[PDB]
């Protein structure tokens, strides 16, 4: 068959971060030669694997968790990094196995009016477990001041939207940031290389 990276990477709208897509992939040839070697990816990594070796390797779980983040914050998405992202809206484990990819979007994902579809979680009352999607917008109460379903003084509407101009510096130009992940050994492999 075929693995639909072409509909993972090349898809139109990327979800904002606080709701991060999770697209399983299975029962297909997953050919990493056409990704890594496109060389348009202004960053990259791989962690429990080294990207060239993959072509020969057989996974099971393959989860492309796409999302848009702010240029300086890719640093925060990795194992071992804490900060507003990895702590609040999107976690990564530390022992996590698989690559991390980004290439600036700033042609598309930004409008001069700073497209605000892209938005994330600022105030959450804890710091995520590994891979916990948090979709709840229920208003935040900083002190003892009852919010009662409205914005309040020392209350917080927990979400926040990045202003993106297209003209931002490299820091605040939005990066599309995919991630991946996988099982490696001991389970029957729907995924393959060539």
């Amino acid at each position, epitope marked *: 068959n075929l693995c639909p990276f072409g509909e993972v990477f090349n898809a139109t709208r990327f979800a904002s971060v606080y709701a991060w897509n999770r697209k399983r992939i299975s029962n297909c040839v997953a050919d990493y030669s056409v990704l890594y070697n496109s060389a348009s990816f202004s960053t990259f990594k791989c962690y429990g694997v080294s990207p060239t070796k993959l072509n020969d390797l057989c996974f099971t779980n393959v989860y492309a968790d796409s999302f848009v983040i702010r240029g300086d914050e890719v640093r925060q998405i990795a194992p071992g990094q804490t900060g507003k992202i990895a702590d609040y809206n999107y976690k990564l484990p530390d022992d996590f196995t698989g690559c991390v990819i980004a290439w600036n979007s700033n042609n598309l994902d930004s409008k*001069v*009016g700073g497209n605000y579809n892209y938005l994330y979680r600022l105030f959450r009352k804890s710091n995520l477990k590994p891979f916990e999607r948090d979709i709840s917008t229920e208003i935040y109460q900083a002190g003892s001041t009852p919010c009662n379903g409205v914005e309040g003084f020392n209350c917080y509407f927990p979400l926040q939207s990045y*202003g993106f101009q297209p*003209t*931002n*510096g*490299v*820091g605040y*130009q939005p990066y599309r940031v995919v991630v991946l992940s996988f099982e490696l050994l001991h389970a029957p492999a729907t995924v393959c290389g060539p």
Partner: antibody
Amino acid sequence: VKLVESGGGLVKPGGSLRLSCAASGFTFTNYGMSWVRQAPGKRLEWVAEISSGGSYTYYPDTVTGRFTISRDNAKNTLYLQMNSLRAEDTAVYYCARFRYGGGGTVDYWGQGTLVTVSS
Amino acid sequence: IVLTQSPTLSLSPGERATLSCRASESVDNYGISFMNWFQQKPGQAPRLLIYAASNQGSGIPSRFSGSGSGTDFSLTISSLEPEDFAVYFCQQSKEVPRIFGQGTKVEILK
């Protein structure tokens, strides 16, 4: 904080000319750049915008004299053609540096340079 | 898309300056904050003042102040200095080419 320009120039109307701005004192990859003109007796016309890493390059419409802009980053440098040189195009151009995103911004400045479109 | 400023105002030291930045079309934007302020002195290329009227600044005397709402951003100064007057410019942003103010110069007698 630190910028350089070309000096003034004289071209017959109808032709083209390439214009320069030389930058220093920061990382010239990480700040989008923009040209701006001042027409004497007229409020500042904002000339054009460029991205930071690779070209966004959007202009005002008006009519474009098809001024084309590009950065040469390893040279920390900015470039402006203006084709279709015409009388009103006489003005003081400026190369200005944005900042990391905000309600803006436009912070620092090239001091500005005259334009002579004349016979 | 069309900003405008007051035709003229002339002032004196100690006075609190407010110039009318007249914005056609929308009021600010859904971004909740926009525009800007700038000052062109003779022989001195212009300079940032307060971005989105709401914020800054370094090198910016706190005597500089203001805010904005609707179609008119509110300029504020306190106890001017007779050498510190220059035309103030308010940008648009977020919509259309950004342009600038038609211009107005604080001017002092005596």
